[PDB]
Design a protein around this ligand. Structure first.
Ligand SMILES: Nc1ncnc2c1ncn2[C@@H]1O[C@H](COP(=O)(O)OP(=O)(O)O)[C@@H](O)[C@H]1O
Ligand SMILES: Nc1ncnc2c1ncn2[C@@H]1O[C@H](COP(=O)(O)OP(=O)(O)O)[C@@H](O)[C@H]1O
Ligand SMILES: [Mg+2]
Ligand SMILES: [Mg+2]
Lengths: 535, 130, 52, 528
């Protein structure tokens, strides 16, 4: 059964088929399915304790000893050192959910684990796994249709961001930033709305710069309608604050020009030496005067510059910053409304950007100075600057803000929402149960197992909140059946009501649909595997 | 690793003068202009010396220990890259600061200058920091 | 049952109740037999040996 | 055996000769076939193979499974090689070939043990295979009116049949329609390089799409790229093979000047060369610029200032597909950028697909290429989806070449077995036993189908045999109803060349294996 077949022929002669077959292993048939289901169940049971507002973080340690405290399921599974192939499949499923949506990366694993757990007892009763997968697909289609039916639309206008703020708050509730919950939701919504193609098009995350610095407080996190820079003015004696700055963005170092081609300049006499010296001095003077001619009050370069340029810039009341990175150069050009000029000769006034305030920021007793550009006219780029008491909560806040931004992006793509708190899963389970009654007997078991697996999310929410899972879930399901209300969920926060509309627990329809679809496809793929041939 | 003998065993070919005091070594490399020598040690500091005067111009510490040093030839002051840490760092000695970094033993600077190899135990474009 | 959130003491008492009910059901379904009936003894022995 | 102080062959040489080695070869072939049995049919299952590096491959394809297996048995490698041959020539049936060859060997093994001469078995195999191929060509159903609607229906049915054994079988109708639509747009050679396969993680299978044009991933944008507009409504596309960067004119070029005026002139000359190339590109009227070679930041900012789109380091295949879709020409020089060498598409747009940026060229009316964008939850998931789509594409191409179809589900093999048994019952009797064994071995595929689906193989085989004997050609295994049904009326259609190649390759492999009587294994050199 294991390691394969070892016969050495019926005549005594050697029987070698596969290289190193004595060192290889093989799992054949149903026991492979049982092992895979068991591994997926272990992964899902590990993940399920980090689901909901009362979920608890996992505290990951990498191979170098670096410590990460997080609730993001995708991050946890990415940093988890697994060897089992099905565990790797679960990690890939979480990463897929993160890539497509950005939220609900923990629900997919729990749902897949519940589906495979039900499939285990379905297999024990003598049902072909392909039949289980087909029934799961049918029930998933039914659940997707039911979600589309019970979905609700919200306004995505910039003049009323209340539904967007509520959705971002629902996303951020489970994270550690629930202390600054409303501020975090507000800044995420404003960041997404400021940089977005209004015609329901994509939201380019390249224009949302997220930077975190230690010190201060978590409440000090703010949205800057400009660019924050991890640089400072080159000369220590230039002013630290520039107002109504006319910005000149340059990608040419303030140095004498040199050809790219292999070049040699020959000095054959003293006159040649004098000419070269005068040429260098006049080149420096000319570049500085050309910069000054446009009327700019500030210069930003990318490739640094030497001492003479520094002193000439200081002497002409031209604050400047050097060695600004390429992405930061692009962000500054976008935000300030200015163009990028490759050489001084092409620098004109119309290519100058504008910023209402350019300042240098100190950070206590740390010697570190970081430049800020803000108060732009119609800046299309924004920056989220995160402060905290230690690096770890800063990273957690970074990924939580990323989750919120992704959720608001999903709302941008599609404005249909479904109320969370387990109400959507309960309603889908009810719909699947009702559809299974009309279905012929053979697929009824698979559809009922799918409904039971769907009902694990409210059970996990009740478990994390201390309530009795089965009793609370049964009561909520009975209430949903009695009165026509698919918005009744698990009162995780003990607010005193089960209706999620008043509690304003809102989830994107796209997120739930992606969760169900991805879980069903991964469960089918795992169910179809019947052999393992590890070395 | 390569240490030439002591007496130079020659007949005054105006090259027997070598300094080579070795007051710091794992990445000793002569610069474009020969007036400066760049060396690194296991203390995580990069030391720049002027060979003529013979004293440390300025030391560079931004890392753990540093191993590999490569220099982009421009006055020997423009840039030099260190990849000792898993953090490729570029320094400018007209200001003495790490101008840019890449968190990713045999780093090699590309002849073009827009990128540099980071062979460890990738072509990182300096114009895009990726 | 445990995963649903039921303490493993209600399960034991409920299983005892189910065992008592099942014992009652099995006793109800049973049929009297006497040792003078050779056919029933032969059938029981054959059923026992059927799986060997 | 004697010591023989001077040995003939090199020490360590292993030799096996006679009937036992032939029986061992047959057993090895059975072992190889057993590894791919459960992958056959709509109720098939996937196999997971892990290499030394730790990477895992999950596949339902027989050829892939055999290739990933590190087979070293000399006789067993024949099955892997014929599976590769079937994959190359046809693209489907890579499991049927191995099953048929192994079943042939299994059926003739008892006669081998009895001392039958291998040449007789080889001749019987050749005769039976020739007769079977002739029968397949004779009874294959084709329609000689060739209308677009029925050709489309036949192609779609063949694609669904070739797809209804993989993990995408739930969406088999959707995938088959999309595959047929992609294939019908190829011009004359049906080149596979003209069909793009892009795998993007995240998203359901139903989210996968076919682009009526070309689409490729964003390629390392430089600074200033985000200021370029990302949508055009009638762009002209300039396909170039040009490095638009400030660089040395040539590798061996050297500039020698002795005056600062000449120094400045040289610098301005380099800048003017770059700007002249850029101006020549701009004045052509093109709005989208794609290059095989890197495009520098200077060129990117220049194009951004002109509200133009640039993308450097575009791969060879993507540029070729763009040329075949938009209808331009790849230019290594920008000195003559006429309207002839400029591409054209209705809509260009850069969108986000599961955390990736993709450039889309849609609206091409005369495109001769296509691009598949596949969505899935895992890397191996998308890989196996690509393999299944490749199988379907190969089947559709072969159907385009010749629309000669036979009903699947084992119906064709039952008909062949009945015909071969009827032929064998009318010959002297030494060849009769072997041809009857061939006909019996032809029953492996329906039996394997029933076994994989969990049926009772014997009853289904008996019903199929009786139905074929009493009349009926396209009656095969009905998986859904656990019974038999008319597979031709059930649209279980297979190109005839699939079975023709399968039978030919299996027969050739069986003959080659039987023909060998002695195996010699030289001692290893440089064991290290
Ligand atoms: N205030 C709340 N009351 C009840 N349920 C909530 C509340 N906030 C979030 N939830 C539920 O918690 C579940 C887990 O959400 P979260 O942990 O934020 O991300 P993930 O879905 O990746 O685990 C969601 O399905 C949501 O329905
Ligand atoms: N709907 C169907 N009903 C019955 N048999 C089918 C059906 N679809 C495919 N088959 C059978 O599956 C066999 C091929 O299985 P598959 O794994 O798809 O290709 P391969 O031959 O490469 O293994 C064919 O012999 C065909 O008869
Ligand atoms: Mg969440
Ligand atoms: Mg096939």
């Amino acid at each position: 059964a294991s390691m394969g077949t070892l016969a050495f022929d019926e005549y005594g002669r050697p029987f070698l088929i596969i290289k190193d077959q004595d060192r290889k292993s093989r799992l054949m048939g149903l026991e492979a399915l049982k092992s895979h289901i068991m591994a997926a169940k272990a992964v899902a049971n590990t993940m399920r304790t980090s689901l909901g507002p009362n979920g608890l973080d996992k505290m990951m340690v990498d191979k170098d000893g670096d410590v990460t405290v997080t609730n993001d399921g995708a991050t946890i599974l990415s940093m988890m050192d697994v060897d089992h192939q099905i565990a790797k499949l679960m990690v890939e499923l979480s990463k897929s959910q993160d890539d497509e949506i950005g939220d609900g990366t923990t629900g997919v694993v729990v749902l897949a684990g519940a589906l495979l757990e039900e499939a285990e007892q379905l297999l024990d009763r003598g049902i072909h796994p392909i039949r289980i997968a087909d029934g799961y697909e049918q029930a998933a289609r039914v659940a997707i249709e039911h979600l589309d039916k019970i979905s609700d639309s919200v306004l995505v206008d910039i003049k009323d961001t209340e539904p967007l703020i509520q959705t971002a708050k629902t996303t951020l509730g489970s994270k550690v930033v629930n202390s600054c919950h409303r501020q975090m939701a507000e800044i995420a919504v404003n960041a997404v709305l400021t940089v977005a193609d209004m015609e329901r098009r994509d939201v380019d995350f390249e224009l949302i710069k997220v930077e975190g610095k230690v010190g201060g407080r978590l409440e000090d996190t703010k949205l800057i309608k400009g660019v924050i820079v991890d640089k400072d003015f080159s000369h220590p004696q230039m002013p630290k604050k520039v107002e109504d700055a006319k910005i000149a963005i340059l990608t040419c170092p303030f140095e004498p020009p040199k050809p790219k081609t292999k070049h040699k300049l020959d000095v054959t006499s003293v006159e040649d030496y004098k000419a070269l010296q005068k040429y260098e001095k006049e080149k420096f003077e000319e570049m500085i005067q050309q910069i000054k001619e446009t009327g700019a009050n500030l210069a930003i370069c990318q490739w640094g510059f030497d001492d003479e340029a520094n002193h000439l810039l200081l002497q002409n009341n031209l604050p400047a910053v050097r060695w600004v990175g390429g992405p930061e150069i692009e962000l500054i050009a976008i935000a300030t409304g200015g163009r990028i000029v490759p050489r001084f000769s092409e620098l004109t006034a119309e290519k100058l950007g504008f910023a209402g305030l350019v300042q240098e920021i100190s950070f206590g007793t740390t010697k570190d100075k970081m430049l800020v550009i803000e108060q732009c006219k119609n800046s299309r780029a924004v920056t989220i600057f995160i402060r905290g008491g230690n690096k770890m909560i800063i990273e957690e806040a970074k990924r939580s803000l990323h989750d919120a931004l992704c959720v608001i992006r999903n709302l941008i793509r599609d404005n249909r929402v479904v109320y969370g708190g387990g109400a959507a899963e309960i309603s889908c389970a009810l719909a699947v149960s009702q559809e299974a009654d009309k279905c012929p007997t053979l697929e009824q078991y698979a559809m009922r197992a799918f409904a039971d697996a769907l009902e694990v999310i409210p059970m996990a929410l009740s478990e994390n909140s201390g309530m009795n899972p089965i009793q609370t879930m049964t009561e909520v399901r009975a209430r949903q059946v009695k009165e026509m209300n698919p918005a009744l969920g698990i009162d995780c926060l003990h607010k005193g009501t089960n209706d999620m509309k008043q509690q304003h627990v809102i989830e994107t329809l796209i997120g739930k649909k992606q969760q169900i679809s991805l879980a069903t496809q991964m469960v089918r793929m795992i169910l179809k595997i019947d052999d393992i041939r590890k070395p | 690793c390569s240490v030439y003998p002591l007496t130079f065993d020659k007949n005054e070919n105006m090259a027997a003068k070598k300094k080579s005091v070795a007051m710091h070594l794992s990445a000793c490399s002569f610069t474009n202009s020969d007036m400066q020598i760049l060396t690194a040690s296991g203390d995580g500091t990069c030391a720049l010396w002027d060979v003529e005067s013979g004293q440390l111009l300025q030391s560079f510490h931004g890392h753990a220990d540093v191993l590999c040093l490569d220099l982009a030839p421009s006055e020997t002051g423009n840039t030099f890259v260190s990849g000792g840490d898993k953090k490729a760092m570029v320094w400018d000695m007209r200001s003495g600061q790490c101008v840019q970094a890449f968190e990713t033993n045999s780093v090699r600077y590309y002849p073009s200058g827009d990128a540099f190899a980071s062979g460890s135990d990738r072509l990182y474009d300096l114009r895009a920091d990726r | 049952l445990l995963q649903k959130g039921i303490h493993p003491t209600i399960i034991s008492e409920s299983f005892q109740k189910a065992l008592e009910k099942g014992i009652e059901i099995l006793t109800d379904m049973s049929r009297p037999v006497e040792l003078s009936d050779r056919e029933t003894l032969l059938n029981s022995a054959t059923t026992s040996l059927n799986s060997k | 055996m004697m010591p023989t102080p001077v040995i003939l062959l090199k020490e360590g040489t292993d030799s096996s000769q006679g009937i036992p080695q032939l029986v061992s070869n047959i057993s090895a072939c059975q072992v190889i076939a057993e590894a791919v049995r459960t992958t056959l049919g709509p109720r098939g299952m996937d196999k997971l193979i892990v290499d030394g590096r730790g990477k895992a491959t999950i596949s339902n394809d027989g050829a892939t499974i055999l290739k990933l297996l590190d087979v070293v048995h000399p006789a067993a490698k024949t099955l892997v090689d014929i599976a590769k041959s079937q994959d190359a020539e046809v693209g489907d049936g890579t499991t049927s070939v191995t099953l048929l060859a192994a079943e042939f060997l299994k059926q003739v093994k008892p006669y081998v043990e009895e001392g039958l001469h291998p040449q007789i078995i080889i001749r019987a195999f050749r005769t039976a295979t020739q007769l079977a191929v002739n029968k397949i060509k004779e009874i294959a159903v084709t329609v000689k009116k060739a209308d677009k609607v029925e050709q489309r229906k036949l192609l779609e049915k063949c694609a669904m049949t070739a797809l209804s054994s993989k993990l995408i079988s739930q969406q088999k109708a959707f995938f088959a329609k999309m595959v047929v639509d992609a294939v019908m747009m190829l011009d004359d050679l049906l080149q596979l390089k003209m069909i793009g396969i892009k795998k993007v993680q995240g998203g359901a299978l139903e989210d996968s799409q076919l682009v009526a044009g070309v689409a490729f991933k964003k390629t390392f944008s430089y600074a200033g790229f985000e200021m370029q507009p990302k949508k055009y409504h009638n762009p002209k596309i300039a396909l170039l093979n040009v490095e638009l960067e400030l660089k040395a004119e040539k590798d061996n070029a050297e500039i020698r000047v002795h005056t600062v005026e000449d120094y400045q002139a040289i610098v301005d000359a380099e800048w003017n060369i770059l700007y002249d190339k850029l101006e020549k590109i701009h004045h052509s009227g093109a709005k989208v610029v794609l290059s095989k070679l890197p495009i520098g930041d200077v060129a990117t900012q220049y194009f951004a200032d002109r509200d133009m789109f640039c993308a450097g380091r575009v791969p060879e295949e993507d540029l070729k597909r763009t040329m075949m879709a938009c209808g331009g020409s790849i230019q290594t020089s920008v000195n003559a950028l006429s309207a002839d060498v400029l591409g054209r598409c209705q809509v260009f747009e850069e969108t986000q697909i599961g955390g990736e940026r993709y450039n889309f060229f849609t609206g091409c009316p005369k495109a001769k290429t296509c691009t598949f964008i596949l969505r899935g939850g895992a890397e191996q998931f998308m890989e196996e989806t690509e393999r299944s789509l490749h199988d379907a594409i190969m089947i559709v191409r072969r159907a385009i070449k010749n629309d000669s179809v036979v009903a699947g589900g084992g119906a064709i093999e039952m008909e062949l077995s009945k015909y071969l048994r009827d032929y064998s019952r009318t010959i002297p009797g030494k060849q009769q036993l072997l041809i009857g064994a061939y006909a019996k071995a032809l029953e492996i595929i329906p039996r394997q189908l029933c076994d994989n689906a969990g049926f009772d193989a014997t009853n289904i085989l008996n019903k199929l045999r009786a139905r074929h004997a009493q009349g009926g050609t396209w009656y095969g295994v009905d998986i859904n109803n656990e019974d038999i049904a008319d597979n031709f009326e059930a649209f279980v259609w297979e190109p005839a060349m699939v079975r023709i190649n399968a039978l030919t390759a299996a027969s050739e492999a069986a003959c080659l294996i039987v023909s060998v009587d002695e195996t010699i294994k030289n001692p290893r050199s440089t064991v290290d």
